Each structure stands twice: as C-alpha cells, then as structure tokens.
Amino acid sequence: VSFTARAKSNVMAYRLLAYSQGDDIIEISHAAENTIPDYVAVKDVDKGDLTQVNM
Amino acid sequence: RSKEISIEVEDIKDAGDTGKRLLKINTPSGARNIIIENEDAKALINGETTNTNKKN
C-alpha cells in the first residue's frame, strides 16, 4: 500500500528518512544521525512537495 | 521498531537489592535514607538531631 507524505525539507534520493507530523499529512525529512530511519527515498522531493510512501 | 528500548531497573539482572533501590531514587535525601542505617548517624548527616540523637 501507500500513503501521502508532505515532505519537510529537501529530501534526497537513497537517503534515510524519518516521519513526523504537523498540520495533518505526515511529514518526511532526512533521518537524524545515530538512530533508526523509517523510509528510503527513491527520488528527490522538494521541501513542501506531496508524494507517496510505497509501503 | 523503535529506536531505544528503554529498559527498566529490574531488567538489570546482576544489580543488587540496595543498588536497584539507589538507581530508582530521585533525591539525595532518598539516597541517604537507603545508605545510612544508624538513625543517629543519619540524623547528623541530615543536619537534624534531637537531644537523644546528640547523646547517642
């Protein structure tokens, strides 16, 4: 399945990502250092750009 | 699958009984209550002595 994510700040492909929340839609950003990431970018995603998370 | 798995005091299998009580304690007064068994000595260390504590 998949769901809509709103990105958060300049996602780069192949980088480790982590989720958060704000206004509504789950926000995606690069995972913080020294922890467990949630998702891997498959493509570059702009700061406030909506996209899909392919679960 | 989380990031930290915050264990609890009783998960530490080779901790001693007093050791676990100390790890759980929040304040220095609580620690002194665990460590000092002689009530007169505890009273001196707490700066709070009765006439009986003083005599002892």
Side-chain angles (χ1 to χ4, degrees), chain A residues 4 7 9 11 15-16 18 20 27 33 41 44 47-48 50 55:
Chain A
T4 299
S9 180
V11 173
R15 275 68 170 186
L16 297 174
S20 189
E27 294 180 345
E33 185 176 359
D44 294 337
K47 183 178 179 180
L50 299 179
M55 298 303 301

Side-chain angles (χ1 to χ4, degrees), chain B residues 17-33:
Chain B
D17 294 343
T18 291
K20 291 174 180 166
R21 289 185 72 208
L22 285 169
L23 183 53
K24 290 177 178 192
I25 212 68
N26 209 48
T27 67
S29 181
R32 292 191 301 273
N33 181 53

Side-chain angles (χ1 to χ4, degrees), chain A:
Chain A
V1 300
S2 72
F3 64 90
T4 299
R6 183 172 69 179
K8 187 170 181 60
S9 180
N10 299 322
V11 173
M12 297 179 287
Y14 300 109
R15 275 68 170 186
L16 297 174
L17 305 174
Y19 68 87
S20 189
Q21 63 174 293
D23 291 334
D24 188 359
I25 296 171
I26 293 170
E27 294 180 345
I28 301 296
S29 69
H30 292 132
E33 185 176 359
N34 297 321
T35 190
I36 298 172
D38 299 313
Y39 296 94
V40 177
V42 300
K43 66 184 291 185
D44 294 337
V45 180
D46 290 348
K47 183 178 179 180
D49 183 64
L50 299 179
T51 190
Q52 297 293 300
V53 178
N54 288 353
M55 298 303 301

